[PDB]
Every structure is written in structure tokens, then in C-alpha cells.
């Protein structure tokens, strides 16, 4: 009956979480996953109000194994030969520290039409030369819905870097949904958005395998994920128990 | 004749590049070069729409040789003795890791009258004490035109740090030219400028010599540069073949 | 050649040799090893076998 | 009834495996196990058609711990003092890297009457001096049947080296059973036996304990083994489900 208050309150508690995230008071979040040939994965996450993004250099996306050998001098040289052909004195043809693939994921509180990406070359130029570069591409149409139980739990853009020439710098950006006509960045709230820049929380870590990422990062935090088998992860909350 | 379409299209292709960069859709870019006594040079570059800058600590500007010995413990101590006289236990009078000179370069798409610099002391105070600090100086009048073939290809501010007391933190900032009356930061576009902060691409690297910098960083990317001999580099594109 | 013998070895440089002992253990039997990587980059990605034209192709055995 | 085809096919599948191994088309296999005082065990395996064997130097049978310290310089010296009394400058009386015991195991597809062993001294002489050495002993009579469920699954020869003077080189050899009068090594097939020499697959590894050997090498591969407690391992297949 309608007197099952445990049931009604459970459904409301979940719906409230869904809706709060999607409010102007809520978070918007982005993740960059960089996939390496040894099967390890670097995640960079940022969480903020209003808008959020991530920007990394070529070098910053390369595999780094904390507290172990990293071929660091040779990898300085690898970099020199990536920035300019035959510029370096590296003892390898292909650095296994280079990302083989990238996945960008946004929380379902993003507006997909606001997503912007600057995928640069290795010296951080968006499109060959600065003089001809538009500083971003709007890539929203390329994002797939990550779905669980009918509910969009996130948005994914996945792209491989399978060729020797895919050597990139990367920045991505999205804005929190706002179906209102209230501009969060206009004069009444603009200094709150400036503060949100200071208040944004960052996380980064390298997991040894996608299994660890799924079990110990995605799942315990109720984050969205799409794995290399095209399987969706996340928690549906809208009107659900 | 006027039927040399290869010629007309070549000139347009170049003029279009010039003009696009200078549009509100284009990049503005800044470089900080830090010159060390061993002749090596650190470059920091940032490229963004609307406005762009760079801010570094004293320590961050010091020479770092990737994958080699860096006297790192002694250089912790050098820092302590720089932050406060006789504060450290360093085994040297003068660290060769300290920059001997700085050059700031802006793309020709900057408005020179918007350039701002905060050149701090070693504990990141602009002017002796915070209570009396204006947080920047407008240094545009000091910028020299980097010219090729009559065309301004960039703007340079060069300053030496030849004394034992020139120990600095440094931030610089400029805004993309905008001869229109359309304010890119006002309410219709403000959230795009907030996104541009996320989307800005950074690059950094230490080159062993100014020769390498000129041959492998400046020249291949059609960047402006002024060398220690006062010679200009860059590519003129306005109405040129 | 053995499995181990075909794995990349870089003469006179670091080879992750202890971890690669463990990689081997986990290759010989699933979950047999204590390796700090999912996929060893020392494993061959491809093989090419070439014979001189003096071979009889009908005698080739693998 | 006789209409249980799952049952009949199961029994045939197993009988076929038994019989195939014992055909002239099948494998014959040998293993040398060297047992060290720290309880670790080195296995050397070889698998080939027609005939198979293994031959190792004194030094090659000594414990080697991959990626760890091995007292390698001192163990060069140990060797010198083993090859000739007082020939070396070793800092130990007894190297713990010396094998304490050896077990030789053959697959049940061997003909036991063909087994040959050359158990040399430390300079690889079968019997004191080469001039008086027969280059092998036929040791088949010493092999015990490794049995499971009534079925011979392998043959074992086990011998300890408990004295300071048991310092050996070792080679063993056996021929695949052939109850026919067809000589596999005669002129019609001789070049196939020469190819079998090239085609033989070798395996070696050091396991930390006999437990690991049993659990992760013997058992998963359906190999025969006899443990230090005289317990048999292997899989019976002849006419069995």
C-alpha cells in the first residue's frame, strides 16, 4: 500500500541525490583516463560547481610508475624526439609510456552541448600552428550515453592513439546543466564562479589494471564508467529504490 | 597577370592565418624563457583564447636537469638561505640553477596595453611586503616589437638578473586583442572565458642551448623569438607569399 | 626457444628482472605470480619466420 | 545401458589420449628436478618426438634466484674449488646452491630399457677419467613406476646427493616406445628424427617449494610426479572416465 514509508523514503532519498547533482548547487565532474600498453590506467578527475575541466601536457600523460624505475633520462630524450623529428638521442623507437587510448567521461550533470576539447600536438598546439588554431572543438555529438537500468549515468568519449604519430596534449571542459534563464556567470554570481575555480578538487592515480580501476575507484564511489568491452557501470537513482 | 590564381591563393592563405590569430576566435600565447649559466634555457608556453598567462614560484624557475643529478638536498638548503638570509645550510655561495635572465614573449595577437607582470621576491611577494604591494605592473611600454620583413611577429620583454640578490617569483598575463566594442567577458560569453581557463594548453621543456631552442622549438612551430644577439625570428604572413 | 627466451632483454640496461620472474609465474599458471603489471611489454607482439630459398617448403615444421 | 553415449565417448576420449601419446606420432618427455636446501626446486623439461633428453653442467644445476642476490663472485670461486681441491678462494665450506637431490622423470611413453644417464663429475667426466669412461649407464631397472588408479603414469629415478663430494654434471636420455619392427631412425624417416632435434621444446623454472611445483606445474599440466613423501601424482586415462 501507500503506507510503506520505508519504500517511499528510499525512492525519495535516491531521487533527491539525482536531482541535487543536477541542480545549480551541485557538482559537475570530468575524468580523463589514459590507457597504457602494460594495461595500467592513469585517471585524472576534477570536481567543481558550475563548470569543470582538465588540461595536461604530453609529458604529464605519459606513464609514471611511483617509486620504481622509469627510464627517466632516456624518456627526457624520447620527448625531445617527439617535439621535433630526430631531435633526441633516445634508445627506443616507441616509448611504452605513451598512452594507447584516452577515454573522457563526464557526470550526467554536464550539459553535453557545452563540452569542449583541445587535443593538441606534443608542443601543445591545437591544430598544426597557433596562427590557424581554433582553440577547441565542441565534441558533444561524439559522446555516448553511459546507461544503467534505462538511466543516463554519464557520458563517454573514447578514442584510440594506435599510431606512432598519435602524440598529444589534452584539455577538456564542460559546463553544469542549467535549464533556467539564470546566468550563473553574470554579475550577481560571477565572483562565486571565480571562487569555484579555487574550490575545484582534483584527484589523480595510476591503477595497475582496469580491474582495479573498476573495483576500487569506479564502483565504491558510484562513478560512471564504460570498459574496453563496452560494458556500462554506475548507479541509477532517478525514482529508483 | 591577375589570372595567377596560385599566387593569389598563396597570399590569401597567409593573410587568413594572420587575421584568424588576431580574431576573437583565435589564440593568444605567452612564453617565459629562463636563461641559465650553463647556457641551457627553460621555456614555459601557454596558449589560450581570450587571455593567457603563466605564474611560477622561485623554485620552479630554477634549473632542473631531467634524469641527472641535481644537488637536490643542497638546493633545498639554497632555497632556505634565499627565503631568509643565513636561513639555510648550503655548501655554495651562488646556485648555478638560478636564472641569469628572463625573456617574456607574447604572440602578436596580444593587446600590449593589457600585459601585466607580477615579479615577486623569492617568497612570492610582489613589492617587499603584501600590505604595500600592488599585485602587478603594466609593462607593455617596455615590450619591443619582434619584426620580420616589416611585420610585427611578436613582442619581447628581456631582463637580466645579474646580481646575487635577483631571486624572483614571476607571473605574467595578457589579453587577446579586441578592437570591437563586444566584451568577451560579459554575460553572453563569460562562461566561455571560464572554459578557456580549463582549455588552455601548457608546454614546458629545458633545451641544452639557445641553438636547440631556435632550431627545434622556435623555428619548426613558426614562433617569434629574439636571441641574445638581438636577432629576430618568426614568419611574416600579412599579405605575403 | 622457450617462452622466457623470446621475451625482450635489453643488454646492459634495467629489465624489471625480479618483477619479470613473477610475470612468468603468472603466465605459467593464472594467478601464480606476484607481478606488479597486467601486461609485460617484454612479450613479443608478433613473430616472423623466414627461410632461405634453399629450403624445401614442404619440409617446414613448427 | 549401451545407449549412454556420453559415457562411451568420455571413455574413448581418454583412451585416445593415452594411446596417442604412446603412438610413434606422439611425445616422449623427460624432467630433471633439482632439489635445494632452501626447499626450492629447479625443473628442466624437454618434450619431443622419437627420443628426448637433457644435459646440464655442474654450474647450470646450481640454484639461481632470478632478480635477487646470488653471491655470484663467491660462487665463481666455489666452482673453482669444486673443479680442483683448494683451487678457489671461496668464503664458504658448502655452497647452499648445490643440489641436495635429483629426480628424473619420464613420461609413460618412454621405453624404460632405452633410458641412459651420464652422471659426470664436476668437470663433466662420466667416470673419473675420459680414457676409462663408458659415456652412459643404462639405468632403467632403477626406475619406479609412478602409478595412479592402477595405471603407470610415469617413471621415476630419485637419488640424493647428501655428501660434500656429490658434485655432478648430468645428462639423461630416453627413446619413445616402439613395439613395431619399423625403425623410426632408418632411411625412410631419419631426416624426420633430425628435425625432431630442432623441434624439441624445452622448459625450465625454479619454484619456491615443492607445494608450488605440485600445485602450479605438475597438476595443471596432467604431469606425473612422485613427491618426497613417496606420494604419486598424475592422471590415469586408459579406458577410464
Curated annotation (Swiss-Prot), chains A, B, D:
Q: Which UniProt keywords apply?
A: Glycoprotein, Host cytoplasm, Late protein, Signal, Viral occlusion body
Superkingdom = Viruses
Q: Where in the cell is it found?
A: Host cytoplasm
Question: Any transmembrane segments, and where?
Answer: none
Spell out where the chain is glycosylated.
21, 70, 79, 230
Tell me, in a sentence or two, what this protein's role is.
Major component of the virus occlusion bodies, which are large proteinaceous structures (polyhedra), that protect the virus from the outside environment for extended periods until they are ingested by insect larvae.
Q: What else is known?
A: The sequence of strain H is shown.
- Protein name (database record): Polyhedrin
The record lists the organism as Bombyx mori cytoplasmic polyhedrosis virus
Swiss-Prot record, chain C:
Disulfide partners:
none
Indicate where this protein resides in the cell. Host cytoplasm
What domain of life? Answer: Viruses
Which positions are glycosylated? Answer: 15, 24
Q: What does this protein do?
A: Major component of the virus occlusion bodies, which are large proteinaceous structures (polyhedra), that protect the virus from the outside environment for extended periods until they are ingested by insect larvae.
Additional remarks: The sequence of strain H is shown.
Please give the name of this protein: Polyhedrin
Species per Swiss-Prot/TrEMBL record: Bombyx mori cytoplasmic polyhedrosis virus (BmCPV)
Amino acid at each position: 500500500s501507500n503506507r510503506d514509508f520505508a519504500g517511499r523514503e528510499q525512492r525519495l532519498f535516491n531521487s533527491e541525490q539525482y536531482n541535487y547533482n543536477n541542480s545549480l548547487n551541485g557538482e559537475v565532474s570530468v575524468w580523463v583516463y589514459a590507457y597504457y600498453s602494460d594495461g595500467s590506467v592513469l585517471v585524472i578527475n576534477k570536481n567543481s560547481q558550475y563548470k569543470v575541466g582538465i588540461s595536461e601536457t604530453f609529458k604529464a600523460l605519459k606513464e609514471y610508475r611511483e617509486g620504481q624505475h622509469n627510464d627517466s633520462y632516456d624518456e627526457y630524450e624520447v620527448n625531445q624526439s617527439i617535439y621535433y623529428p630526430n631531435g633526441g638521442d633516445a634508445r627506443k623507437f616507441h616509448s611504452n609510456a605513451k598512452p594507447r587510448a584516452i577515454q573522457i567521461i563526464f557526470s550526467p550533470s554536464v550539459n553535453v552541448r557545452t563540452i569542449k576539447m583541445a587535443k593538441g600536438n606534443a608542443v601543445s598546439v591545437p591544430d598544426e600552428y597557433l596562427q590557424r588554431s581554433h582553440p577547441w572543438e565542441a565534441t558533444g555529438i561524439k559522446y555516448r550515453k553511459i546507461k544503467r537500468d534505462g538511466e543516463i549515468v554519464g557520458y563517454s568519449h573514447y578514442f584510440e592513439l594506435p599510431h606512432e604519430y598519435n602524440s598529444i596534449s589534452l584539455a577538456v571542459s564542460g559546463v553544469h546543466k542549467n535549464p533556467s534563464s539564470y546566468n550563473v556567470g553574470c554579475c550577481h554570481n560571477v565572483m562565486d564562479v571565480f571562487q569555484s575555480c579555487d574550490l575545484a578538487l582534483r584527484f589523480c592515480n595510476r591503477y595497475w589494471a582496469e580491474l582495479e580501476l573498476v573495483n576500487h575507484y569506479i564502483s565504491p564511489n558510484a562513478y560512471p564508467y564504460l570498459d574496453i568491452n563496452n560494458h556500462s557501470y554506475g548507479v541509477a537513482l532517478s525514482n529508483r529504490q
